[PDB]
Amino acid sequence: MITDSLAVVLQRRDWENPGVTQLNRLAAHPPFASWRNSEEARTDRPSQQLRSLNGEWRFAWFPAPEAVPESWLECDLPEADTVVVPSNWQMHGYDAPIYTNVTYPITVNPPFVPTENPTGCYSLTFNVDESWLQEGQTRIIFDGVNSAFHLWCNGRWVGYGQDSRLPSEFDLSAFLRAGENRLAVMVLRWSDGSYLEDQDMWRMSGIFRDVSLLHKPTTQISDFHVATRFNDDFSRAVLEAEVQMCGELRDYLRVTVSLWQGETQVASGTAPFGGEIIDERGGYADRVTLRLNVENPKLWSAEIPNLYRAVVELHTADGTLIEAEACDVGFREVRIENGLLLLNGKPLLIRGVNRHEHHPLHGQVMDEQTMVQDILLMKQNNFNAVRCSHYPNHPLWYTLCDRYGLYVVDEANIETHGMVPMNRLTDDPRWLPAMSERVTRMVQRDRNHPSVIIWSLGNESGHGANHDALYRWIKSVDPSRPVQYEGGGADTTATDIICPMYARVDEDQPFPAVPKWSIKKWLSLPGETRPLILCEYAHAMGNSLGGFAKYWQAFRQYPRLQGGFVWDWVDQSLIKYDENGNPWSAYGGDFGDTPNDRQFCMNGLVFADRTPHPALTEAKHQQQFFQFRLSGQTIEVTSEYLFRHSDNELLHWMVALDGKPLASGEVPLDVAPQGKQLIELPELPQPESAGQLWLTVRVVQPNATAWSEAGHISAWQQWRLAENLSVTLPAASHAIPHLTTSEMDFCIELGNKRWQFNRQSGFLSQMWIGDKKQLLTPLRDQFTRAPLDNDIGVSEATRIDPNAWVERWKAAGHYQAEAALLQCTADTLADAVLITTAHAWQHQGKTLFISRKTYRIDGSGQMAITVDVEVASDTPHPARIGLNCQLAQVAERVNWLGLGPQENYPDRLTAACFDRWDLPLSDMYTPYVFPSENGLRCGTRELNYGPHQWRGDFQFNISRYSQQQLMETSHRHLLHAEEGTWLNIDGFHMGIGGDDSWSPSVSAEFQLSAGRYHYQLVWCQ
Template sequence: MTQTLAQILARRDWENLGVIAVNRLSMHAPLQFWHKNEKPVYGQKSNNESVLNGEWQMSYFDQPEHVPETWLQTDLVTGDKITVPANWQLQGDYDVPIYTNVTYPIPVKPPDVPEQNPTGAYSKVFNLPEDWLSAGYVHVTFDGVGSAFYLWLNGEFIGYSEDSRLPAEFDLTSAVQLGENRLCVLVLRWSKGTYLEDQDMWRLSGIFRDVTLRHLPEQHLLDYYVTTTLDADFDQAIVSVQTKSTADVFIQAALYWQNTLVATQINSPGTEAIDERGANPNALQLDLIVDKPYLWSDELPHLYELVLTVSDKNKVVTHIEHVQVGIRKVAIVNGLLTLNGKPLLIRGVNKHEFHPEKGYAIDETTMRRDIALLKQNHFNAVRLSHYPNQQRWYELANEYGILLVDEANIETHGMIPMNLLTDDVNYLPQMLARLTRMVLRDRNFPAIILWSLGNESGYGHNHDALYQWLKQTDTTRPVQYEGGGADTIVTDIIAPMYARVSEDQCFPVNTKWSLKRWISKPGEQRPLILCEYAHDMGNSLGGFDRYWQAFRQFERLQGGFIWDWVDQGLAKDGDYAYGGDFGDSPNDRQFSLDGLLFPDRTAKPALQEVAYQQQYLQFRWLNGQLSVRSEYLFKTTDATLTYTIVVDGKPMKEESLTLKLPPETKKDIVVCLPKIGQQDVFLNIKVTQNVSTIDLPAGHLLAEEQFVLQRKTQFVSLPVTDRPMVVETSHAVMITSRHNKWYFDTDTGWLTQWLKDGEQQFITPLQDHFTRAPIDNDIGVSEVANPDPNAWEARWHDAGWFNLSAQLDDFAIAKVGAFIEVQTIHHFLAGHEQVLSSRKTYRFNADGMYLTVDVSRNINSLPPARVGLQVQVGIFDGLSYVGRGPLENYPDRHSGARMGYWTQTLDELTTPYIFPSENGLRTAVSSLHWGSHHILAPQTPLQIGASRYSEKALIQAKHRTALVADAGVWLNLDGQHMGVGGDDSWSPSVASEYLLTAPFYHYELMWTVN
């Protein structure tokens, strides 16, 4: 008896733990059913496939029970056109996107969800070719639907599915008809599966991956499983192919290398290789021997092609499958994760499937753009955080050489305790389905080197079952899982999150161990790979070089996965939205903006640091000899090395030579230096690729390095000129020369104005400056409801640092030889506490001033964010400086920057973080000039910044588009600047050596206007 829509919904499958799916077919490897005469192309569809992407009809309801019965027969007048694949929250005036990190977006009452459950009633009309109806089967596959859906065809109920990140396949054969067919899909935003999908991401829903119809011949493959086994010397491989199929077929496996047949075998199911009695009519194993195989790796992603040909009992070919095969061996040997016998160093990143306009719907163009950027910046691995990706991503990873961690779509971060569900046997079938279906789909992809049981779900007995199933099902890959302390019995790899290099972190519940403590644990021999580290939220990634020093020093520290790849900012009103911008509640604000890339895939400055630290070529300079060492494990470097000797910003000598460097070897190069006087001398090295490869074009920059061979000593003093005159009034002092006038306010002690030939140079007084617009790491919030009281922003705010009051203690003016000297002493109070004092000595000649600043700090007070000066000057287009560049860099994030003579515009000097904050600093600046202004740092270099936006504006604005440029340019001249940190973004992470905790600071500068 046919059930009505109401009767089906009354079952409430979405809240029933006994229901995983209804009528959903078993998971299997990807199948495309190519015809014999078709030429297959990976990423394209066969003639036996029809994609239903494009325009669909959708009606939106606030709960499924409000969908009328008539919807199954005809589209509703309330419906709209909608694009598939996409998320409905991004296509119309429906419910809103919700961004939350840990907190569930619904009341936590598992397995129940709210009655108000946003629902999309989708429909699509399609026609089938007549030959699809005459024989065989018709299936439909939904590659990704969130979070649960019901399916009907021509009014007939087909099935139900959960797990938003894996394909759901259904047999439509009994319901399809000649002519028009109407597919109805009822998508629910919330289901019991929501409790297993509490990932740090935008919570969106809808049909967001491909929908594909497939025609299956009567005799066909049901599944296949390819494994590769190598001998001890890696000289011979066995490619084993296990298949399941319908009965009465012959299956031929043919392995090709670049269109040349390597090995082939044909047999019929039921052979003893799979079943000693020959009693399994559907199973078959074929073994192909490959001598001297080309091995697959991330560096050399050699792929064979396996062609599986299915024939009926009359030897008529029914269909063909084409499979990428990478022959490689992943194993843990002597405590090290190895690939083809070589210990790996994971240069990894976590990556969500995210597009700023399309949400979860990722097109191939975006995938290829991501892979190009990964390769260009020396990444070799991606953790698929925190769910299986769409099939095409794995194929591209196979092709281009990206090591993958495939992760089950399981996260229960917001449960209290976190393992409440993962330790509940009632949830075991739900969890097991998510893991097993992922493995059965993905196990043939050679790019996958690790399986993951999920993310941040604590440790429960259900994990034991998942781990044991994996170890029995796939012996070719280790298992990684962080939950429960990073070293439970269900992980083959110690996989901590955000462990610091040397410092343990003491938390109320437990202590988070440092990396060095982990690898020193007695009896522990597993490799350590950080599943997440280096949280790049906003202006971050300070101290990143410390991790890479440790990775290269300690063999069992085998790298990690940065968090994360791209800012999750959704396009809105000409910019990118974060949590709360859609009125979504709960939300975790800008915690979604923690990628190395902006949402449009343009790079943040921190990526420069990452690329430098991860580059495969390492350099050393000693006594006129340059040593180049390769960290490639398999690839010979075929490149051009160019070294340039730069003297005072100008190339003096340049030489290029061919660099043929086998893997894991080094080469020494003698560099003859010319005779040079007291000048800046930099040795710049660039290595560029000679020939194009699949992943990188010819001419691509493989590595760069710089050695500062000499800095010129700047014995700078203010030239003797005609001594300026002094004019004193009751509240001011004017120092005047032929072309310049300087004004001091004797009540405040500030240098308030500088006139050059009557033209104002200052818009605001030149003042001491000790704060910065808090960066995300200063704010220290991963959950809005749980801010860190020890965060720097909170401590500075509570102590009154953003409202420091300056008290003038002394103002003195004197004639000193040919100069006028002004000395001021200011005390700075936070509330009633004196926290800082600044003594400034200005020495003026006719053309400029020499300024000496001595700052003393109350050692019982907080350290400041900076010790420097700030002034707003007239607008200019850009400036030139000698210092580190070309991109923004900070005291604890500058190893990837180069010393140089740089000229940059104001836009280039500013980093447009979506959530405004301190940005744009340049370190080690010995001189700068713009227009007729020249500033020298004669003793120790300065840190400088120039921006159209005031610190106050940066603090008050919640989006960069809300910033209004001032009339002039805010110039920061810092003697010292605090680091940015970035081990994580929710606890103070700036290393002690980059905190301004010294009792005294001194800096000098000379400023002239020509």
């Protein structure tokens, strides 16, 4: 037929028209399986009426839709390959994925898209049983197609669809034939729907979610809604189920809804069709509402995800079953009352994270195994909520969240971040239909899931009248869930919750017309009463999450600060192979994509392979459900659970003196929700030996759960007990170090040890143990670090951001400053040799820093170093103040007394505990995909590496990579281990920040602004 040809179908250019978002697409609805057996529906066994078309398909790539030959509609192309479906065709190397943050990947000219529009032609040959075509309705379901597509069946045009993130269904009953059938799908990379899909993520395309065939009878269940109502104390519930049908109504038709708790039927109801009168013309003859009473229902929550099974039966009066549908039911009430978000009558505290659907190998194709891995990792790290940023997810995600227990914010697939202004489309009534489809079809698909507690209207689209209209539509159709939206300043008329992104705890950010007030100040603005839940905060880009504890202190102090969603869960890195088949993680620009936003795609708490970043432990500690207070010998344990008793918790305490255990014990936890338990410790040891006594408590779950193993640690806390200062005089050795003075250097010898101080540079240049040199590079002051992602921000060589810390440091000359020797003197004491040095670091005639040191080598072989540094008040505050050297030794393990075991920084050390830690050298380096300063351990009093030992009170990192190499290397796989080991010992280190990664975010109390600094070290063997 001419009308089925490509020349006719493509002529209207439906993908450059916001007025046409679909053609011949069926209505949205909750998940259906069309069970013909009620027991199978109840037990959720696979349905023979639902058939997966996933598997091997034929695929051909074209640069534009006009390049597809007409013969593709009739037979498979000879050049076509065989590919796995679902998939993204960028993951098969057909064209490159594009990573851009805010700028659209195409020329901004709505609704038009470039003529060179990459086109993917999918096709499948499949058989259909004759029973399916004898009677009933056969539909095909595309769970997701990016970004738009035309559909042919046996050469006849079927329909068109947009909104890559929601299912598209088409009736194939009039197109299918008995035996062999062929499906032809033409997928377009760009469409007018792409203007509503400007999320900060990789831009891919293809049939990236499941494809299936569903067979329904002619008389069928077409929609069903489940609602729960409760009394004041939640002891009585009414389960209201509205069922809708299509087909011929007959007086013998009946609907039965039965509720099951496991194997036991709790409630049931049967009724003929015909609803109550609603207006002058009557009621719905094709609908019925059944109300089931449930006594003492088991309530659903993230703490205890109690679920019931509701089965909806369509049957005749005699008793023969026509069709069955089922869904999991969670009894829970969500509402905002007096400014607080309540779940089952109790105020929530959202321990949330944003999660994109990302896999380093399969792109944006999701699988049950990855979903379960993510959910278990989140729950094991004290997360209780997830934001579907920024689109409806794969349908199995909501089922798994129902089952395991996580609150879900379901978000419409609308983001127009790149528009200027941001609301240019969302304030235009001509785009209201397209926006409305994306909201309404999501609600229609997901409104039955108990895990979904909040709807979101999208992300970063400004504030337009369409937002207000769709907010009100949701409030009318589903009053059971609050609606939130951040655009337009996060407190507009289109949101029930103040939901800002990256608003800071105490600091105001008064931007024009969309200020980000401090969250504490925001609550008290005149006339403001809503709760505040950050939809994004604590931007976890690289070495980040500095200041997380401040957020959680505020969340616990202020009732209307009910938490937030960290940005974000997993790095969006992709895997590439070099010349040796070795994989390496890639970010923006690594696929030839341009313009790109480089490493801003990696903001996760876990790597793309789901291994954790160090910041995850900080998040876990701050988000823990047990809070602790110490008063003398008693421990006060406060529970932050709202519904469950501590029936799987054992408290273990340990007392150690500078790392060596002295006493320990175990006490079972029995604390009610939001209750307290006082734990009286026995008479703790009081050693007369010098050192600090430390008490450490940890909560252990003795029994495995659905989401954790036996012995899982869920919370911990540490305190300092009594301290005994050391007043013992050092052992007076009889040997005296010998000083030899040449015009080049001072040489100090004691036994087999030797120290050399270069007199022209003023630094310790070499150290000998026997005849073995210990240093590859002299011991020198260091004031800089390889810049973090938070240090760099949005700055780059093309667009310099002068406010970024790295740019201020570079302009001030911190990285190029040259040390000028001021003095270097050697003196012999009664029992030691004293070296005094002074240096000035200068850049273009300006003295940035002055370092004055004293080296005291005594008869015991120990070298005591005192450092006093002055920092010019008008230079930017330095990243660190310390020493560094390249040791010749390469040892296998690192042992230290201090905060650990994981890397920690001054504004990100609350999760770390003081103890004796011993790790392999490799664990002392954090392999961030974008290399930077990493692996620091703070609060360290002793460090052991090979024969060397350093003592004092310092921060350190130790690795095979110099700060220079880390700074100059753009990818972690390009790093090479240098000879020996680089040691950085810092008296002082600046915070890492992380409130956001595009502006300075290190709070004042963690900047090195004091002007004068002092620290001491003891180096011995």
